[PDB]
Structure formats: structure tokens, C-alpha cells
Amino acid sequence: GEAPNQALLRILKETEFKKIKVLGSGAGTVYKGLWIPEGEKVKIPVAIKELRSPKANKEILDEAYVMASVDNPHVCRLLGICLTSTVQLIMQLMPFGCLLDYVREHKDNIGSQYLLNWCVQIAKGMNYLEDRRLVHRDLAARNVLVKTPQHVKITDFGLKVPIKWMALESILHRIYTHQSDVWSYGVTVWELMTFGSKPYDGIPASEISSILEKGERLPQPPICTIDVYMIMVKCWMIDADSRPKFRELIIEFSKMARDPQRYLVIQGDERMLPDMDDVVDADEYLIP
Ligand SMILES: Cn1c2ccccc2c2c3c(c4c5ccccc5n(CCC#N)c4c21)CNC3=O
């Protein structure tokens, strides 16, 4: 017997927000933008998704339903929607992009304290979705966004298939559980420790299911101590009850984050990251 979803959905007028520049274009287009709530003397940096009638509106409006329902410091938040001829989604702006790109561009300047802190925040976000009884079903470094290098947030929980990230039981039996999300968390962590590398690269997706059944897994990254890899491997067990809980993954990585140089060995680790008067971040602007 689930409890009522009392989340508020906000409808915004197109006059309230302006599109400065486009962050990404597809046959939907995402704009960097600013949002001035009516009569508030506030300007909020936003990302606006717009669609070129498609009747894929059931898919976008479902995504918006999930984002309004969640509130967490490590989960992405939806500010409102705009019921224009082509429906617009307004979300908080993550200036530094997805964590996958961020890790690949800055590999040479990213330290071990950052890596460990990211794994903590992701596990915090995923632990929230567990509390809300929400199964992400598609965790991957591409679906974690970077508000600042110090602060990342999970995205895309509302929804080619990502076989390389999927648990084995999901591949065989289309079974999705929080414990299948822990597996995908292990691949994500692996992506960050490998500085954005591609898992099972050069391997066809059909082969991967039998590979796992043999007991083969992703290899240990070079920076990774056995303690950190050990945690990744625990995520990739066949028996989902054997894998760690997100609540345990916060704990373990938090312990490592206190002495980061003991769990990750990166060369030059110590030496190694980045009218606006009324601008406030969305996280400072909340309405009640
Ligand atoms: C490409 N991209 C960015 C590049 C640099 C900085 C931010 C983004 C960004 C953002 C979003 C999105 C977003 C939201 C829904 C669908 C696609 C989105 N993209 C681009 C997709 C890719 N890659 C976004 C995006 C949603 N909020 C974003 O910041």
C-alpha cells in the first residue's frame, strides 16, 4: 500500500524564462537558459528541453513526472514544465556536463579525493531512490551530471539497451531491482577509476551475457587498490542478495574518502579543479 505522491508540479510561462544558448541539439534540443520567476527579483540558471506533435509527449511527460517527485541533494530536480505548443521541460543547470565527459577531459587533473567523493554522492543519490522505492534502471557515468567538480547529481531515473551496464539477471530475465542498480553502480565506479574508459570494449553485446556466466568481470583499473576493486567486484556477484546495499556503499567509500591516498594511487595526486547580481542557484531557491 503505497503513500500518495503529493509532489507539486509547476507550470511556467514562456515569458518567465529565456534561452541564452543551446547545450545540445537533436531531432529535442536543450538550451542553457535563465528563469526569472514572476515578481521575485531572482534569476535562476536552467536547462530547457524542447521537442520539435510528436506524440512522444507521453515519454517526456512521464520523465517530468518522475523528476518532480524526487528531492535530494544528489538527485537532479525538475523546476517546472511549460505547456507550449511544443512542451518544454525546465530543470536545474549543471554547467560542467555529464561526469563521463568531465572525467575524460580532465583525467590528467583529477585527484583521488574527487573520485572517492563522487562515488559517495552517487551512492547517496541511489540510496535516496531506494528510499523512494524508485529503481533507476540506467545508472552510468553519462547519467551523472556535474553541478560543480565538488557536487554531482544522478539523472535519467525516469525511463539501444545498455547491456554493458546491466546486471546479469536483467540481461537474461528483464529483471530490474535496486540490487541490479548496485551492479550498474559498480560499472559506473569502474568508469570513473578508468577515467572514462569503455567497459568490455571491442566485445559484442551478445557475447557479454555468457562472459558473465563464466565468471569473467571488468579488469582492475591501475589506480585502484584491491580494497576499492574488491568493492566493485562485490557489486558484480550473480546472487543479488550477496551484492552490497547502497547504504553500505556510502559507508565504505566515506571511510576511504578520509584517507584517499591509501585507496587510490594516482601520479602526482597531491598537486592536482575549477547582470549576474540576482543570480541564485536552484538549490537555494525553494518555494513553500
Ligand atoms: C548535453 N548536455 C549538457 C552539456 C553541458 C552541460 C549541460 C548539459 C546538459 C544538461 C542536460 C541535458 C539533457 C537533458 C535531457 C536530455 C539531454 C540532455 N543533454 C544532452 C544529452 C547528451 N549528451 C543535456 C545536457 C540537462 N541539464 C544539463 O545541464
Curated annotation (Swiss-Prot):
The active site is at D138 (proton acceptor). Residues 17-264 form the Protein kinase domain. The lineage of its organism: Eukaryota, Metazoa, Chordata, Craniata, Vertebrata. Changing I11A: Abolishes phosphorylation. The modification Phosphotyrosine is found at Y285. Changing E38K: Found in a lung cancer sample. It comes from Homo sapiens. Ubiquitously expressed. Isoform 2 is also expressed in ovarian cancers. The record marks Y285 as: Important for interaction with PIK3C2B. The gene is EGFR. This is Epidermal growth factor receptor. There is a cross-link at K21, K41, K55, K58, K214, K245, K255 (Glycyl lysine isopeptide (Lys-Gly) (interchain with G-Cter in ubiquitin)). The chain holds residues 696 to 1019 of 1210 of the full protein. Belongs to the protein kinase superfamily. Tyr protein kinase family. EGF receptor subfamily.
